[PDB]
Enzyme design. Structure first.
Site, mmCIF file in Angstrom:
data_model
loop_
_atom_site.group_PDB
_atom_site.id
_atom_site.type_symbol
_atom_site.label_atom_id
_atom_site.label_comp_id
_atom_site.label_asym_id
_atom_site.label_seq_id
_atom_site.Cartn_x
_atom_site.Cartn_y
_atom_site.Cartn_z
ATOM 1 N N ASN A 1 0.482 4.060 -2.303
ATOM 2 C CA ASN A 1 -0.456 4.749 -1.422
ATOM 3 C C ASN A 1 0.147 5.047 -0.051
ATOM 4 O O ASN A 1 -0.016 6.154 0.473
ATOM 5 C CB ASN A 1 -1.752 3.951 -1.278
ATOM 6 C CG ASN A 1 -2.707 4.188 -2.439
ATOM 7 O OD1 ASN A 1 -2.878 5.314 -2.910
ATOM 8 N ND2 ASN A 1 -3.336 3.122 -2.908
ATOM 9 N N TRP B 1 -2.485 -1.333 -2.261
ATOM 10 C CA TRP B 1 -1.666 -0.774 -3.338
ATOM 11 C C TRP B 1 -0.532 0.109 -2.798
ATOM 12 O O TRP B 1 -0.483 1.326 -3.001
ATOM 13 C CB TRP B 1 -2.478 -0.065 -4.433
ATOM 14 C CG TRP B 1 -1.629 0.111 -5.644
ATOM 15 C CD1 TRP B 1 -0.928 1.228 -6.003
ATOM 16 C CD2 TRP B 1 -1.343 -0.876 -6.638
ATOM 17 N NE1 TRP B 1 -0.242 1.002 -7.167
ATOM 18 C CE2 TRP B 1 -0.479 -0.281 -7.581
ATOM 19 C CE3 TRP B 1 -1.739 -2.202 -6.828
ATOM 20 C CZ2 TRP B 1 -0.007 -0.966 -8.698
ATOM 21 C CZ3 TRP B 1 -1.269 -2.879 -7.941
ATOM 22 C CH2 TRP B 1 -0.412 -2.260 -8.861
ATOM 23 N N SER C 1 -5.523 9.311 -7.866
ATOM 24 C CA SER C 1 -4.115 9.275 -7.475
ATOM 25 C C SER C 1 -3.264 10.351 -8.165
ATOM 26 O O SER C 1 -2.082 10.475 -7.838
ATOM 27 C CB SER C 1 -3.462 7.929 -7.848
ATOM 28 O OG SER C 1 -3.932 6.818 -7.079
ATOM 29 N N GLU D 1 -10.852 7.555 0.817
ATOM 30 C CA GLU D 1 -12.110 8.274 0.629
ATOM 31 C C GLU D 1 -11.960 9.407 -0.382
ATOM 32 O O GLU D 1 -12.939 9.753 -1.052
ATOM 33 C CB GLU D 1 -12.700 8.763 1.947
ATOM 34 C CG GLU D 1 -13.714 7.784 2.545
ATOM 35 C CD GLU D 1 -14.798 7.374 1.556
ATOM 36 O OE1 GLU D 1 -15.322 6.246 1.675
ATOM 37 O OE2 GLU D 1 -15.105 8.175 0.645
HETATM 38 C C1 LIG Z 1 -5.008 6.079 -7.517
HETATM 39 O O1 LIG Z 1 -5.658 6.573 -8.423
HETATM 40 C C2 LIG Z 1 -5.078 4.627 -7.139
HETATM 41 C C3 LIG Z 1 -5.359 4.576 -5.616
HETATM 42 C C4 LIG Z 1 -6.796 5.036 -5.301
HETATM 43 O O2 LIG Z 1 -5.185 3.253 -5.165
HETATM 44 C C5 LIG Z 1 -3.777 3.926 -7.542
HETATM 45 C C6 LIG Z 1 -3.883 2.422 -7.924
HETATM 46 C C7 LIG Z 1 -3.382 2.319 -9.394
HETATM 47 S S1 LIG Z 1 -4.666 1.590 -10.549
HETATM 48 C C8 LIG Z 1 -5.706 0.291 -9.738
HETATM 49 C C9 LIG Z 1 -4.769 -0.777 -9.167
HETATM 50 N N1 LIG Z 1 -5.253 -2.163 -9.412
HETATM 51 C C10 LIG Z 1 -6.505 -2.636 -8.989
HETATM 52 N N2 LIG Z 1 -7.306 -1.834 -8.345
HETATM 53 C C11 LIG Z 1 -3.157 3.784 -9.695
HETATM 54 C C12 LIG Z 1 -2.501 4.208 -10.976
HETATM 55 O O3 LIG Z 1 -1.769 3.370 -11.530
HETATM 56 O O4 LIG Z 1 -2.789 5.387 -11.281
HETATM 57 N N3 LIG Z 1 -3.208 4.600 -8.722
#
Ligand SMILES: *C(=O)[C@H]([C@@H](C)O)[C@H]1C[C@@H](SCC/N=C\N)C(C(=O)O)=N1
EC number: 3.5.2.6
Length: 268
Positions: free
Chosen positions: A107, A80, A45, A143
């Site tokens: 997202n 998310w 992310s 992906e």
């Molecule tokens: C990005 O890195 C993540 C995308 C792929 O969903 C997003 C989600 C959160 S951490 C995981 C959330 N909880 C359970 N799976 C994140 C972040 O805080 O960097 N980015």
């Protein structure tokens, strides 16, 4: 001025069970700390911070862009999307989507903005335009977080991340109003309290963007830090691991940030 003081990064990554990449820059003297700094790691992310900077760059030529209202359907809401799901029935502005993408890693917001910029190739083109020849975004969301060992898609290096972050937050890549807006969004991030921020004293300003792919022990953070009484520090900390079900660690990211500040001689 690189690695004037050695730090035990190798022991840290061995205890973690994977690889750690670090590049930290003291913008006053130019001294750096560097460990696996030119290896590629998955962005996860963390691409969303550079996405928001690209939106701000476009807004320099489009005065109305940031306040443009964007409506979206339920099909846009992927897992998310904590802010955009509360505005499904109303829409959000481009600036609000950008803030949500940076500060909550939203997202759906990031996907809408990626569309506006022309997709992964459009964000990559913006990074080329500031002189970053390493960054690549290749896929749309979900992906893009696969973090497959050896796959260069959707990766950058800690060094290129830090260099581009410096250009956008402290250098001349954005006009002054847009530069401060980017800084303000980073300062407001809510997802990084256990990463670089955990190594930074509470009386210093700091902004960051996180990434957590969910597989292959792959997670990251980059930040600008303003210690009082001296020039700011820019740094990036990326991790990965060999097995798909290896877990990531926030503590390892914080510990790597502490070692970077120690290597630069920044009292914390
Ligand atoms: C990005 O890195 C993540 C995308 C792929 O969903 C997003 C989600 C959160 S951490 C995981 C959330 N909880 C359970 N799976 C994140 C972040 O805080 O960097 N980015």
């Amino acid at each position: 001025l690189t690695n004037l003081v050695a730090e035990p990064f190798a022991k840290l990554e061995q205890d973690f069970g994977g690889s750690i990449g670090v590049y930290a820059m003291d913008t006053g003297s130019g001294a750096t700390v560097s460990y696996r700094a030119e290896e590629r790691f998955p962005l996860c992310s963390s691409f969303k911070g550079f996405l928001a900077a690209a939106v701000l760059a476009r807004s320099q030529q489009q005065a109305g862009l940031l306040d443009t209202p964007i409506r979206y359907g339920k099909n846009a809401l992927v897992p998310w999307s904590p802010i955009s799901e509360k505005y499904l029935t109303t829409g959000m502005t481009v600036a609000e989507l950008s803030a949500a993408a940076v500060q909550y890693s939203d997202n759906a917001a990031a996907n809408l903005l990626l569309k506006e910029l022309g997709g992964p190739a459009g964000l990559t083109a913006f990074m080329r335009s500031i002189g970053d020849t390493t960054f690549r975004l290749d896929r749309w969301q979900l992906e893009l977080n696969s973090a497959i060992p050896g796959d260069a898609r959707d990766t950058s290096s800690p060094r290129a991340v830090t260099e581009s972050l410096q250009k956008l937050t402290l250098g001349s890549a954005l006009a002054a109003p847009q530069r401060q807006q980017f800084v303000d969004w980073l300062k407001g991030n809510t997802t990084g309290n256990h990463r670089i921020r955990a190594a930074v004293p509470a009386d210093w300003a700091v902004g960051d963007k996180t990434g957590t792919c969910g597989v292959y022990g792959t997670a990251n953070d980059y930040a600008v830090v303003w210690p009082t009484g001296r020039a700011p520090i820019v740094l990036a900390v990326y991790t990965r691991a060999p097995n798909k079900d290896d877990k990531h660690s926030e503590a390892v990211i914080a510990a790597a940030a502490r070692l970077a500040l120690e290597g630069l001689g920044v009292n914390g």
